[PDB]
């Protein structure tokens, strides 16, 4: 029937909105985890490089 | 005609269960991907 | 009498509306309480279904399932579209004349499937309790009525004695009362009042005469050949103790 198909289309629209919101939030989660793997890979690399440099400065001073 | 409404309510509950399992599938693949990224970062950091 | 009278209320409201409710339950077994479309029920009159379905024609005509299938004692006009659509179409149908099944008890306060099951339960249970409560009230009559009306006689005696006890006069060391006794009752009262403490003092006054005599009680005291016409002469009023005894002339 007509309103039968209308209610079925409303259920399909709810499922569509649910899956689109799931895609958006999963993309945001993997994005922020990618930036935290990023910028953490920045911070510890710069810290260890500076530790290596300070060790070389102290060795040549000694 | 009563069986039409019964089958429609049944298959709409089936579609809602399928959408719920799809959302849970999104969540568990995202958790597995975050775990894989943490493992890659830890392995690269240890070798580095 | 709480239980059975409220049982008769529930049984009378059940038996008149078992089959339309079970019919709409078998008709609505694809939507018991589904959260998209209310089921406007109307047990209505004979074949004037287009007059109430004009509101559904004003509603969705290629949709919005509304009809009356069977049980032609009252046409079960069910309407089902949506929430607000069925509400507004029910308002228009009530403007054309319609009413929803909102009754007391459990049928018009719950969903129709389980309420029809509860009505089947009460229809299959209640005459057994009808018979058993009649049997227990019969037993309660046959082995309680004697002692309860005996204590009723006792209670009427006690209430009569205490309400007549205020017709006395006393202060602090004694009372006095006055009464009227017919003259053929003097030995019975005399032997009854001979029992008490030191045969406490009676005054058997010959009554004051016809002057200032309206408060005197009256009896008839006729010989037993003329006795049974006292009711036939006492449909009317009573004499004044000094008016002639009218009763022998009617025999």
CA-atom Rg of chain B in angstroms: 21 Å
Largest sheet of chain B, in brief, is: none
Cα separation of the termini of chain A: 90 Å
**Number of DSSP strand runs of chain B:** 0
Q: Looking at the chains present, what oligomeric state does this protein adopt?
A: part of a larger assembly
The tally of helices of chain A reads 2
Overall tally of domains of chain A: 1
Function (chain A): Produces ATP from ADP in the presence of a proton gradient across the membrane.
Protein name (chain A): V-type ATP synthase subunit E
Family (chain A): Belongs to the V-ATPase E subunit family.
Domain V-type ATP synthase subunit I N-terminal (chain C): 15-103
Kindly describe this structure.
With 62 residues, chain A is mainly α. Chain A has one domain: F1F0 ATP synthase subunit B, membrane domain (Single alpha-helices involved in coiled-coils or other helix-helix interfaces). Chain A is 94% helix and 0% strand. Chain A has 2 helices and no strands. Chain A has helices spanning 2-37, 40-61. The radius of gyration of chain A is 27 Å and the shape is rod-shaped. Chain A starts with a helix and ends with a helix. With 48 residues, chain B is an all-alpha fold. Chain B is 96% helix and 0% strand. Chain B contains 1 helix and no strands. Chain B has one helix spanning 2-47. Chain B is rod-shaped. Chain B starts with a helix and ends with a helix. Chain C has 251 residues and is mainly alpha-helical. In chain C, 42% of the residues lie in helices and 7% in strands. Chain C has 8 helices and 5 strands. In chain C, β4 and β5 form a beta hairpin. The radius of gyration of chain C is 38 Å and the shape is elongated. Chain A binds chain B through residues 4, 8, 11-12, 15, 18-19, 22-23, 26, 29-30, 33-34, 37, 40-41, 44-45, 48, and chain B through 8, 12, 15-16, 19, 22-23, 26-27, 29-30, 33-34, 37-38, 40-41, 44-45, 48. Chain A: Keywords: ATP synthesis, Hydrogen ion transport, Ion transport, Transport. Chain A: Belongs to the V-ATPase E subunit family.
